[PDB]
Amino acid sequence: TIKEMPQPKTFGELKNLPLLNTDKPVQALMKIADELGEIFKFEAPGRVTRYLSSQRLIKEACDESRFDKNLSQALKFVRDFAGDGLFTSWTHEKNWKKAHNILLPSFSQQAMKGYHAMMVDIAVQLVQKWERLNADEHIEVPEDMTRLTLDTIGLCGFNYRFNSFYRDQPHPFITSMVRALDEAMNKLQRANPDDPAYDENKRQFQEDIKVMNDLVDKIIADRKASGEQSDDLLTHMLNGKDPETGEPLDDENIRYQIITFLIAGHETTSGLLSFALYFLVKNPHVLQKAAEEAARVLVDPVPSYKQVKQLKYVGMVLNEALRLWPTAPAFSLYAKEDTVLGGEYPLEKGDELMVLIPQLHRDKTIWGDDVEEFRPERFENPSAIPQHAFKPFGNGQRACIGQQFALHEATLVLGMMLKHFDFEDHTNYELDIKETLTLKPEGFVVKAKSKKIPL
Numbered sequence: 001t002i003k004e005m006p007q008p009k010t011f012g013e014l015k016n017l018p019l020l021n022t023d024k025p026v027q028a029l030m031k032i033a034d035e036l037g038e039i040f041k042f043e044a045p046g047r048v049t050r051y052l053s054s055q056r057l058i059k060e061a062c063d064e065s066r067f068d069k070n071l072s073q074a075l076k077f078v079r080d081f082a083g084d085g086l087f088t089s090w091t092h093e094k095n096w097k098k099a100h101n102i103l104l105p106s107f108s109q110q111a112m113k114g115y116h117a118m119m120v121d122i123a124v125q126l127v128q129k130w131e132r133l134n135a136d137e138h139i140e141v142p143e144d145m146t147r148l149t150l151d152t153i154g155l156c157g158f159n160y161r162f163n164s165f166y167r168d169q170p171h172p173f174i175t176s177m178v179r180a181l182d183e184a185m186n187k188l189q190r191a192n193p194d195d196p197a198y199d200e201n202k203r204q205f206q207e208d209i210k211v212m213n214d215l216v217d218k219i220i221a222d223r224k225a226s227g228e229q230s231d232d233l234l235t236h237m238l239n240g241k242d243p244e245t246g247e248p249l250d251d252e253n254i255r256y257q258i259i260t261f262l263i264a265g266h267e268t269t270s271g272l273l274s275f276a277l278y279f280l281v282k283n284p285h286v287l288q289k290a291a292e293e294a295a296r297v298l299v300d301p302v303p304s305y306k307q308v309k310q311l312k313y314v315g316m317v318l319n320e321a322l323r324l325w326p327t328a329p330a331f332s333l334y335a336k337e338d339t340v341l342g343g344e345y346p347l348e349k350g351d352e353l354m355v356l357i358p359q360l361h362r363d364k365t366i367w368g369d370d371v372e373e374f375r376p377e378r379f380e381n382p383s384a385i386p387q388h389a390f391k392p393f394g395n396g397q398r399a400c401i402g403q404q405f406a407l408h409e410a411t412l413v414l415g416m417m418l419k420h421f422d423f424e425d426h427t428n429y430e431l432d433i434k435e436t437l438t439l440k441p442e443g444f445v446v447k448a449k450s451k452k453i454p455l
């Protein structure tokens with residue numbers, strides 16, 4: 001029966017907008033969900049979002065006949081530099097299905113066999129860094145995980161070394177990209193974006209866009225000139241033809257795809273690894289079980305593709321980390337037609353929804369009494385998990401194209417970490433979650449003790 005939707009506290013003419021005037025807006029929306037329940041309406045001047053938290057409503061939202069991917073205001077601001085790349089394109093834009101058809105074979109489980117050697121190159125650099133720390137020293141976990149995942153996509157993406165493990169200060173491309181991502185998220189909080197107080201922010205944003213376009217356009221121009229045929233995404237994009245249109249991607253679209261993959265390499269897999277290590281050091285019995293698997297499976301100096309596929313428990317640890325702290329914490333949908341959600345909430349064509357993935361993953365009606373516990377065994381049997389209960393990679397045709405790539409890299413790296421080191425939570429770290437487009441532990445530090453196993 002038709003029901004009024006709950007709404008959080010309002011601030012006069014600003015409606016709900018000041019609630020997201022925080023450096024931690026996803027965590028603020030999570031606390032609102034805990035108070036108000038499975039659905040609430042969020043109003044700002046000239047916009048309304050509905051936030052979904054229950055598997056009961058999210059299983060309907062994931063119906064692709066009724067709901068399509070929406071560009072949230074965040075993705076609309078990211079589109080100023082990610083353009084009509086896969087992540088910031090509407091499903092109905094020609095370049096979405098065209099790039100999707102061309103890039104799917106580059107991201108398949110088969111393709112991971114070709115990327116494996118480049119992933120091992122960077123993973124070996126991480127292990128050697130930790131082997132070379134002095135007794136007195138500690139590891140900055142998200143810092144080192146972000147060095148690794150950025151370098152991996154640089155090498156598999158377009159055969160470029162960011163050489164992040166040689167640096168204290170990021171490569172200039174990365175300085176610009178991080179500052180562009182920060183400006184996109186900060187613009188969400190501006191009641192009056194045209195006020196001249198923000199004129200410096202706008203000039204810096206254009207300069208940062210220019211820096212990203214110049215390196216990426218030069219890399220594309222340099223590859224075309226040389227005719228080199230490396231086994232990277234850039235070669236696949238320069239050579240590939242969409243079976244449907246018979247057309248290749250143009251150079252502008254290739255640039256947007258590369259910027260998109262570099263954003264992913266910086267923002268996502270690094271968060272997953274950082275949360276996975278956090279949960280392992282907080283759950284020593286789980287760390288022991290994962291370390292025992294790494295020791296039994298990784299019998300060679302270098303992991304092989306086939307050995308990574310056999311790290312089943314490590315896979316389960318990664319899924320249980322994605323459950324409790326999904327590094328990509330939301331995706332947006334619009335109603336394709338007038339419709340009723342959950343027999344209760346009427347929606348008009350075009351109405352926007354936001355899926356709060358961390359809340360979905362805490363639904364006690366799905367996961368049971370032990371929902372706050374880190375228990376990778378709950379992923380033993382995928383058929384035992386209710387439909388649409390677990391969405392860390394999004395939904396349907398607009399799900400993460402990088403899912404196989406991220407899980408292969410994360411499983412390889414976590415396996416090698418568990419083979420090579422014992423870990424100590426030497427500070428009794430209190431979880432502090434920094435938000436960009438994604439969630440990461442901030443200030444998470446550990447000490448490693450080498451098991452002295454040669455590479």
Ligand code: HEM
Binds near residue numbers: 086088100265392402
């Ligand atoms: C643990 C790591 C990752 C997580 C949790 C993750 C999560 C997501 C999610 C939730 C979406 C759906 C977004 C939406 O509906 O708006 C998505 C889309 C996407 N991801 Fe990832 N991602 C990860 C890693 C990667 C990597 C490494 C890449 C590329 C190298 C990548 C590339 C993309 C792209 C291109 C899309 C858009 C797909 C499309 O609409 O056609 N992701 N990702």
Ligand SMILES: O=C(CCCCC1CCCCC1)N[C@@H](Cc1ccccc1)C(=O)O
Binds near residue numbers: 073437
């Ligand atoms: O829910 C949020 C704030 C958390 C985004 C987190 C999201 C950003 C993309 C990647 C996944 C994580 N933003 C909505 C609604 C909105 C719009 C304008 C002003 C304030 C809120 C939006 O961007 O459409």
Ligand SMILES: N[C@@H]1CCCc2ccccc21
Binds near residue numbers: 260263400
């Ligand atoms: N994995 C996609 C593309 C890269 C950045 C991002 C951020 C939030 C959610 C999904 C994604």
Ligand SMILES: N[C@H]1CCCc2ccccc21
Binds near residue numbers: 142163170
């Ligand atoms: N993105 C890397 C580049 C190398 C330097 C650095 C430092 C902290 C955190 C990340 C990074």
